[PDB]
Symmetry: C3
Subunit: 77 residues, 3 copies
């Protein structure tokens, strides 16, 4: 069952990479918006929003890994 | 063969971390320069540059997973 | 109980640590941006930058070290077989 488990890891690498890519675009955006704003109350909402968004993304990736792990177990029998 | 496929997976994980590491120094550089500058046109150019550089890095990592996908196929048969 | 199933969990453990690294770095980056908006003294800001940089390097090196473990542990599993 070597090819199946291998395909699984390739899938995983893609998930984590996409998460990494989405977090990067989030950080470029947080820096861009912060440079644009002067009001600190307003800047704090952008930061608070990026933070929870980042948290959603990390959690999504965490569940994907958990699912890849469970699927490995079944393929293991 | 299993050992070769695992070697492939270790290689891939390392390259994904390398992309993560390069993005982080990029993000750190972007914040540093933005704190240094006041002119927004110049700041937007720093932001634009870091962004395209981030995509290049992201695109290379995507190609690497793709290579790893091809290579795994060849080895399993 | 396969050698392959054990190699597989090694990779699962490996993806987690790297994600954990990415998560930690992401929080370092947001904190640095937060403090940057809060401060006007450049000396202070540059110190916060140096701190995040050193912290980010350690996290990356911690992850590089775990990869070296996975690689070595994987080798060990090679002769070990069903």
């Amino acid at each position: 069952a070597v090819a199946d488990l291998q395909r699984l890891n390739i899938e995983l690498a893609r998930k984590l990479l996409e998460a990494v890519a989405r977090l990067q675009e989030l950080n470029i955006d947080l820096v861009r918006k912060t440079s644009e704003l002067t009001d600190e109350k307003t800047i704090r909402e952008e930061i608070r929003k990026v933070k929870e968004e980042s948290k959603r993304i990390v959690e999504e990736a965490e569940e994907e890994i958990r699912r890849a792990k469970e699927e490995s177990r079944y393929i293991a029998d």
